[PDB]
Structure 1
Amino acid sequence: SMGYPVIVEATRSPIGKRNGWLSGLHATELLGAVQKAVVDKAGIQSGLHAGDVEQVIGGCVTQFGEQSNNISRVAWLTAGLPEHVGATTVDCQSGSGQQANHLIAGLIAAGAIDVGIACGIEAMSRVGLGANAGPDRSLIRAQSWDIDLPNQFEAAERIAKRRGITREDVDVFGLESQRRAQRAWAEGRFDREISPIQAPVLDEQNQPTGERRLVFRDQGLRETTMAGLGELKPVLEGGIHTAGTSSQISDGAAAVLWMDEAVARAHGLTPRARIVAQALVGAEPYYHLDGPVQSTAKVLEKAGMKIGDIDIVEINEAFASVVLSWARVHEPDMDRVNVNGGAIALGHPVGCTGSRLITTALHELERTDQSLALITMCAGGALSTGTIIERI
């Protein structure tokens, strides 16, 4: 009546740019394709079928329109998967896709389910940030609200000033994210984790042409130089972050298949990883997005580990300053941080990214035959998710 949760499979779509390669897919189609993909992948060398999954939990931030009404469920049904499977959609802002994994692991630990999928979706081309708040944003908080909680761009600058991070510092970091992303793609590091996705071809306007083709690669990569980044214009007046040093607006989905260990064996699936420690903590509202400092501290503490014990770190590149702040505090070996690039180069479909990072981290641990990875993300509402996973 108690479970031992392990990851048995993980996959993700390539990540499309805004109005890009995946923008012709209904949000429910994009998530549905990735849910089905993780099941199909597990099915190749086992007898596992979609009907064996008991619950799906998916992260999604802007739960409006195509992404409202429990997209995790609507996606499952839209993809033609079995109706008896339960589904829930969760929102802790950009932490959502990561928390989705924590939550599935918990249901397995409790003996509630033996097989579950944790996933994440965001189709930002079709449902943009703030679509869920309505036209008068003043209305979404109570009159009494008196917390200095800045928007994401102001946050990035407040964090930069807090650490003495310059335009030079962030441009250097943004260059390196593009370089590592390109290296990963040139070497084929993402081949295992990606499920290529069929998508409608768009004419030069954004109407479908009738064409439907496979999309293989992350669209956000582009040739980048220090000089080129230096010409970029800051999002805010007096700011240091530009499009070249901020996460991209993107479309994508990711899914991770979890099982109780003994049940994995019965299905003939190999346990690949487990959670050593997990957390979702609150951060300092003034800075808003400096929470990775706290979530990292918390999982290290729970695991009885130090930053040096970790082989691979995935810290979401919401903005360059978020990562540089975390680094100044935790003093990691940066050769171990976002080794295949991050959201500055690869994109950040907000509700997807948490599951995407767990997927990317696991595959990098396997590629290099290493053991421990830390995943940490800043999140809206001054929150941060953290996970330490270990290979089995």
Structure 2
Amino acid sequence: SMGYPVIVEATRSPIGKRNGWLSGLHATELLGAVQKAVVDKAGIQSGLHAGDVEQVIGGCVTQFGEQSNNISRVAWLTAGLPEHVGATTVDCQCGSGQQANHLIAGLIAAGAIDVGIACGIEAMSRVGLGANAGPDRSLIRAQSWDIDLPNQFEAAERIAKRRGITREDVDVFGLESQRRAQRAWAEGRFDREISPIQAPVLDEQNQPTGERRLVFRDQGLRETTMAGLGELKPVLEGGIHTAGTSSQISDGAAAVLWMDEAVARAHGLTPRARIVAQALVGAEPYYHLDGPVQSTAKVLEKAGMKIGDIDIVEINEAFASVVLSWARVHEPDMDRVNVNGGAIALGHPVGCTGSRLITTALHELERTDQSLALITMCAGGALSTGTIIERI
């Protein structure tokens, strides 16, 4: 239409563990640092400045306290960035950070803006899941509510049972998530996409020691063995998922700089990717988190593509069974799926992850000189986001 949106830059913090390396930052400082970082990554040779950005849209799930009151705006102001830039924070639960990209591209397509930033934040050390309601969570839905929507841990089990996924099957998968994340770090695959973040050091009681680190490494990786995974106790009684086959609670932020193509060309910025097809669809409430099956089918239809066409898949690892369910339906080549590991090993700062995945997918297309990626996430409320991006 009146714009042609392309990604020119994308960057993410390292992902910290709960009460870990980034836990001493205010949620607004963490997001602000990455917003600033993605602008800075355009370089002096771009002539682009933060005040050339027209709008920022960031995903965030638990919009309480530090994360309330439009954190995307608060962060941007806290990082010292120019006040005339508009900002909006979005919640479609887990997919927020991905839908933030979809929305920015849409405003560029519409000719409403020429330059945008899509981002996501979750400082789960600071603002934990469920802070955005009081203790009796029955109160948050109307008395008339009668949809079998399970909690996410029961959802993963129901999905495993529906697909015949076993304890062994998920352990094998969790192991390979850690292995591939450790490969990626060993080989320096994440070195382009990461913006190291200054954070204060907190001790085991969460108290400042005085020192600050520039944090540049994902915290969630660790020595993992099948035997080790075999010993872990399941989160639910009779469940198959354990800590080692579920995403980690994490702190992180990620941001993607978008422009209309002719504005990228003016700044001499290579257009790196565009969206082929995007969606956000509802899933079956009973299974809750099997939605990647539907968002994948919806983007493949819109793109006129099949799963064979896609070079790289990033499908969030909220639980092993979610990915394995998806794969038994859509039948990918698993060597193409989460090639640098996923949330089991890397962490899942919920509102960040959808921008983080777009960042990770793009850079791996670039590293391997390939063309197409598919990004897909399950999300609370029984939803799912899907993107296919193509390198330009």
Q: Tell me the TM-score normalised to structure 1 length.
A: 0.99
Q: Secondary structure at the match of 2:158?
A: helix
Question: Residue 204 of structure 1: CA displacement?
Answer: 2.5
- Whether 1:24 and 2:24 are equivalent positions in the alignment is yes
SS at 2:11 equivalent: strand
SS of residue matched to 1:42: coil
Question: 2: distance between equivalents of 1:201 and 1:184?
Answer: 26
Contact 1:43 / 1:49 at 8 angstroms: preserved in 2? Answer: no
**Equivalent-residue separation in structure 2 for 1:269 and 1:120 (angstroms):** 23
Q: Secondary structure at the match of 1:195?
A: coil
Q: Tell me, yes or no, if the aligned pair for 1:35 and 1:76 is still in contact at 8 Å.
A: yes
Unaligned stretches of 5+ residues in structure 1 = none
Q: How many angstroms does 1:135 deviate by?
A: 1.6
Once the two structures are superposed, residues 268-313 of structure 1 have per-residue CA deviations (whole angstroms, 9 ceiling, x without a partner) of: 2110000000000000000000000000000000000000000000
Mapped partners of 1:275, 1:31: distance in 2: 24
1:283·1:382 contact (CA, 8 Å) conserved in 2? yes
Pairwise CA distance, 1:46: 1.0
Aligned to 1:148: 148
SS state of the match for residue 45, structure 1? helix
Say which SS state the counterpart of residue 274 (structure 1) adopts.
strand
C-alpha contact 1:14 1:194 (8 A) present in aligned 2: yes
- C-alpha deviation, 1:92, in angstroms: 0.2
- 1:135-168 deviations in Å (ceiling 9; x for gaps): 2111000000000000000000000000000000
SS in structure 1 of the partner of residue 34 of structure 2: helix
Shift of 1:27: 0.1
The offset of 1:43, in angstroms, is: 2.4
Matched position secondary structure for 2:46: coil
Unmatched tracts of structure 2, length 5 or more = none
Q: Distance in 2 between the 1:7 and 1:220 partners?
A: 28
Distance in 1 (CA, whole Å) between partners of 2:52 and 2:183 is: 38
Aligned equivalents of 2:28, 2:207: Cα separation in 1: 18
Render the CA deviation track for 1:102-150: whole Å, top value 9, x for unaligned.
0000000000000000000000000000110212111000000000000
Give the Cα–Cα distance (whole angstroms) in 2 for the partners of residues 265 and 210 of structure 1: 45
Q: How many percent of aligned residue pairs carry the same amino acid?
A: 100
Q: Which residue matches 2:368?
A: 368
Which consecutive aligned stretches of 4+ in structure 1 deviate over 3 angstroms post-superposition? none
Q: CA deviation at 1:203?
A: 2.1
Shift of 1:44: 3.8
Check whether the contact 1:309–1:372 (CA below 8 A) recurs between aligned residues: yes
Contact 1:13 1:197 in 2 (8 A): yes
Q: Give per-residue Cα distances to partners, 1:186-241, cap 9 Å, x unaligned.
A: 00000000000000011231111221110010000000000000000000000000
* Whole-Å separation in 2 of the counterparts to 1:42 and 1:378: 31
Distance 2:191 2:50 in 1: 23
TM-score normalised by L of structure 2: 0.99
Q: Distance in 2 between matches of 1:144 and 1:77?
A: 42
Secondary structure at 1:200 match in 2: strand
Residue 266 of structure 1, CA deviation: 1.0
Indicate the RMSD between aligned Cα atoms, in angstroms.
0.6
Q: Work out the number of aligned pairs and report it.
A: 392
Say whether residues 1:262 and 2:276 are aligned partners.
Answer: no
